[PDB]
């Protein structure tokens, strides 16, 4: 593998987590903890003073992050600011997994020029992760402009007909551009996990 150790922090207590983390005391490899509330990192910090917490991403990393495993980069593209929390979970997961990451945020198609202003960056990625909720159409527009794997992530932030990400999920599954592959809602971690594999062939 070489895959860092991943702790799903949703169902675990701060004590239970320190118990898993320090039980991995023998690893030169980093440890990622995803879906970790700020109130729970508050609890953890005295036990793990060498840990790093990423507010938006709700991710914690313990350990020395070594250099990127590979030169190419993953691009993480978002439609709007409401998408930032789950995009950040994809960026931190990908970086902890050893990938260089280029963050291309707020390029939703209501101001499509912003998407073109940053298009050379998207086109130079080995993998593109597209993240959207309201403007789920962005996956299809990105997918029509790039010749690399695109992994779409629907998010649950939206209004009434967003159906808490469900519309966004169906929109990405139904993209008229080919080459788009989809993960379940809010699952930025899952997208980065796959993108990391694809990137490090």
Q: Which stretch binds Zn ion (CB under 5 A): 10-18, 52-60, 71-79, 93-101?
A: 71-79
Least distance between its own copies and beta carbon 26 (Å)? 19
Nearer of residues 34 and 58 to Mg ion, judged by Cβ:
34
Nearer of residues 48 and 146 to its own copies, judged by Cβ:
146
94-113 positions binding Zn ion, by CB under 5 A: 108-109
99-118 positions binding Mg ion, by CB under 5 A: none
Contact 149, 181 (CB under 8 A): yes
Nearer of residues 124 and 179 to Mg ion, judged by Cβ:
179
166-185 positions binding Zn ion, by CB under 5 A: 176
Helices (H), 2-148: 14-23, 38-44, 84-96, 112-117, 119-123, 138-145
**Residue 85: Cβ within 10 Å count:** 17
User: What is the DSSP code (8-state) at residue 77?
Assistant: E
Q: Which residues pair with 127 in a beta bridge?
A: 74
Helices (H), 59-152: 84-96, 112-117, 119-123, 138-145
116-155 positions binding Zn ion, by CB under 5 A: 135, 137
Contacting residue, 63, 98, 108, 143, with Mg ion by CB under 5 A: 143
Least distance between its own copies and beta carbon 110 (Å)? 4
**Residue 163: Cβ within 10 Å count:** 14
Residues that bind Mg ion (CB under 5 A): 143, 178-179
């Amino acid at each position: 593998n070489g895959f860092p150790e991943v702790i799903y922090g949703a169902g675990k207590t701060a004590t239970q987590i320190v118990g898993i983390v320090q039980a991995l005391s023998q690893q030169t490899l980093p440890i990622l903890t995803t879906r970790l509330s700020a109130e729970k990192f508050a609890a953890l910090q005295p036990a793990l003073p060498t840990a790093v917490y990423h507010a938006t991403a709700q991710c914690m990393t313990v350990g020395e992050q070594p250099a990127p495993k590979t030169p190419g980069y993953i691009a993480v593209v978002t439609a709007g600011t409401s998408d930032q929390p789950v995009a950040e979970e994809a960026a931190v997961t990908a970086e902890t997994f050893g990938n260089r990451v280029e963050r291309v945020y707020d390029v939703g198609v209501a101001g499509i020029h912003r998407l073109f202003a940053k298009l050379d960056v998207i086109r130079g990625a080995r993998v593109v992760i597209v993240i959207a909720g309201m403007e789920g159409a962005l996956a299809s527009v990105v997918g029509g402009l790039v010749d690399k794997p695109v992994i779409a992530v629907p998010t649950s932030v939206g209004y009434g007909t967003s159906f808490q990400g469900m519309t966004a999920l169906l929109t990405m599954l139904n993209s008229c551009a080919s080459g788009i592959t989809v993960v379940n809602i809010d699952n930025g971690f899952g997208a980065a996990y796959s993108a990391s594999m694809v990137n490090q062939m």
